[PDB]
Amino acid sequence: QEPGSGIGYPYDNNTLPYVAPGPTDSRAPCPALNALANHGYIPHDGRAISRETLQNAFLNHMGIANSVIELALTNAFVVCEYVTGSDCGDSLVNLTLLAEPHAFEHDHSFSRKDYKQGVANSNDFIDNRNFDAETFQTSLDVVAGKTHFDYADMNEIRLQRESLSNELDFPGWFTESKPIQNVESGFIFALVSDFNLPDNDENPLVRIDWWKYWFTNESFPYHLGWHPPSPAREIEFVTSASSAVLAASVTSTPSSLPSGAIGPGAEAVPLSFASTMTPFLLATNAPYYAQDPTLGPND
Ligand code: HEM
Ligand SMILES: *[C@@H]1O[C@H](CO)[C@@H](O[C@@H]2O[C@H](CO)[C@@H](O[C@@H]3O[C@H](CO)[C@@H](O)[C@H](O)[C@@H]3O)[C@H](O)[C@H]2NC(C)=O)[C@H](O)[C@H]1NC(C)=O
Ligand SMILES: *[C@@H]1O[C@H](CO)[C@@H](O[C@@H]2O[C@H](CO)[C@@H](O)[C@H](O)[C@H]2NC(C)=O)[C@H](O)[C@H]1NC(C)=O
Ligand SMILES: *[C@H]1O[C@H](CO)[C@@H](O)[C@H](O)[C@@H]1O[C@H]1O[C@H](CO)[C@@H](O)[C@H](O)[C@@H]1O
Ligand SMILES: *[C@@H]1O[C@H](CO)[C@@H](O)[C@H](O)[C@H]1NC(C)=O
Ligand SMILES: *[C@H]1O[C@H](CO)[C@@H](O)[C@H](O)[C@@H]1O
Ligand SMILES: *[C@H]1O[C@H](CO)[C@@H](O)[C@H](O)[C@@H]1O
Ligand SMILES: *[C@H]1O[C@H](CO)[C@@H](O)[C@H](O)[C@@H]1O
Ligand SMILES: *[C@H]1O[C@H](CO)[C@@H](O)[C@H](O)[C@@H]1O
Ligand SMILES: *[C@H]1O[C@H](CO)[C@@H](O)[C@H](O)[C@@H]1O
Ligand SMILES: *[C@H]1O[C@H](CO)[C@@H](O)[C@H](O)[C@@H]1O
Ligand SMILES: *[C@H]1O[C@H](CO)[C@@H](O)[C@H](O)[C@@H]1O
Ligand SMILES: *[C@H]1O[C@H](CO)[C@@H](O)[C@H](O)[C@@H]1O
Ligand SMILES: *[C@H]1O[C@H](CO)[C@@H](O)[C@H](O)[C@@H]1O
Ligand SMILES: [Br-]
Ligand SMILES: [Br-]
Ligand SMILES: [Br-]
Ligand SMILES: [Mn+2]
């Protein structure tokens, strides 16, 4: 928000306004990076981004400690080298390249279509990067009529997404990604669980309106009473939440789940790609921004 607005105070004392991405700006498949870029906490053009810039943006503006993004930074830079074909040092070339499929970006996302979702021909691909309201609605529908949800509900959400994606993706494309996805499940609990409840740290519940605002608008839900977690969330919270989602008993089982969908997930680890492997072409779509309604500087 505008620095003088005091909207972030006393949690964030140095805010910057929302500015919609323009057609030449680079955006990510990540609702967090996109929100940071929309505020200029990382470059508004989404290009040439250092590790420290990312660390500071997350810590100071989203209440997410450095430990939370350690693996994510490692993997961003692995993918950057894989896509561009050279080491990019400490300047991530852009955000868009993070949507390289079957890499850091993965199938069965909460709010994005899959790279080969619903394609008639094997060589076709679609936008697996921009926010897709229909896809997100498939996630929200699992918790329809609710204001909050818990670990078991999140487990049901990701299962519904896995089932839909396995059914809809071009045959042979779908690849389950429980470890990366459920770190992101933990990220959701870290950012938008309801810290106003007495047992938030032990038993976090996601506030659905906060989640929907963040994802749909790619800006921060201050108007709904959200603020950056204080103290900043650490990696222990995130992986604990990740484990808890996957440990939660399943009471409704969708058809068409891949093998071993239900049960514990492996620890997320650094990515690696063969030097002989050519990257898949990136979707070239202009960056998504909220248009119903469009957002003002304080939104
Ligand atoms: C350098 C730090 C980060 C990088 C490089 C990064 C990268 C990515 C990428 C490539 C995806 C796409 C995965 C997919 O859905 O296919 C993604 C998704 C996601 N990210 Fe980020 N991420 C970072 C930090 C964070 C943080 C700190 C949060 C929140 C605390 C966050 C929230 C999410 C969520 C919730 C998704 C899933 C979106 C969906 O499934 O629709 N990310 N991230
Ligand atoms: C973010 O950065 C990535 C990585 O550099 C950009 O994707 C790449 O964009 C270039 C065009 O600038 C593509 O190069 C072209 O490739 C075709 C086919 O190989 C070739 O015939 C052309 O002469 C040219 O070399 C490259 O394919 C593409 N990489 C991938 C894997 O898709 C991306 O455009 C950047 N996005 C933004 C919004 O800045
Ligand atoms: C995206 O952000 C906009 C702007 O903040 C939200 O629109 C506001 O919604 C609230 C409900 O909390 C209303 O009181 C305001 O009147 C709205 N303002 C405008 C300009 O319409 C919008 O709801 C957000 N989207 C989501 C899905 O959360
Ligand atoms: C991205 O741009 C490519 C050429 O630069 C196209 O060949 C791709 O199909 C893809 O097009 C989509 O996104 C662009 C954004 O530049 C739109 O202009 C297209 O209409 C399409 O949605
Ligand atoms: C914001 O400023 C107030 C007033 O000086 C201070 O009490 C608070 O600690 C600051 N918040 C942060 C996160 O630095
Ligand atoms: C989230 O984190 C837990 C604990 O490491 C994993 O088991 C899960 O697969 C996901 O990566
Ligand atoms: C989540 O999982 C990690 C290991 O993946 C632990 O290090 C952390 O304490 C938390 O339980
Ligand atoms: C790890 O931490 C999470 C979040 O604090 C808990 O909900 C979980 O029960 C475990 O203690
Ligand atoms: C990962 O951690 C969670 C939360 O502590 C457990 O519920 C799960 O059994 C696994 O050990
Ligand atoms: C875990 O526990 C739940 C209780 O709701 C059962 O529905 C499920 O079959 C699993 O055993
Ligand atoms: C078992 O409970 C889950 C949520 O924990 C529901 O989504 C499901 O329909 C069934 O009631
Ligand atoms: C219980 O919930 C699951 C996951 O949301 C559905 O796939 C199932 O049909 C039932 O409604
Ligand atoms: C739906 O069905 C699956 C497999 O039968 C169970 O693992 C799950 O607990 C739910 O009852
Ligand atoms: C987004 O942009 C539109 C431009 O017409 C405005 O109507 C809206 O108030 C917001 O600034
Ligand atoms: Br670029
Ligand atoms: Br489809
Ligand atoms: Br797994
Ligand atoms: Mn995806």
UniProtKB/Swiss-Prot annotation:
Enzyme Commission number(s) from the entry: 1.11.1.10
What result follows from mutating C30H?
A: Retains most of the chlorination, peroxidation, epoxidation, and catalase activities
Catalytic residues?
Answer: E184
Question: PTM per UniProt?
Answer: N- and O-glycosylated.
Keywords annotated in UniProt: Chloride, Cleavage on pair of basic residues, Disulfide bond, Glycoprotein, Heme, Iron, Manganese, Metal-binding, Oxidoreductase, Peroxidase, Pyrrolidone carboxylic acid, Signal
Q: Bound how, and how many: what does the cofactor note say?
A: Binds 1 heme b (iron(II)-protoporphyrin IX) group per subunit.
Which residues carry a glycan? N13, N94, N217, T239, S240, S242, S243, S249, T251, S252, T253, T276, T284, T294
Question: Where along this sequence does the record place binding of heme?
Answer: C30
Reactions catalysed, as given in the entry: RH + Cl(-) + H2O2 = RCl + 2 H2O
Broad class of enzyme this protein falls into: oxidoreductase
Any one Gene Ontology molecular-function term assigned to this protein's record: metal ion binding
Query: Where is Mn(2+) bound in this sequence?
Result: E105, H106, S109
Described by its record, this protein's role is as follows: Catalyzes peroxidative halogenations involved in the biosynthesis of clardariomycin (2,2-dichloro-1,3-cyclo-pentenedione). The enzyme also has potent catalase activity and in the absence of halide ion, acts as a peroxidase similar to plant peroxidases.
Name used for this protein in its record: Chloroperoxidase
Q: What organism is the protein native to?
A: Leptoxyphium fumago (Caldariomyces fumago)
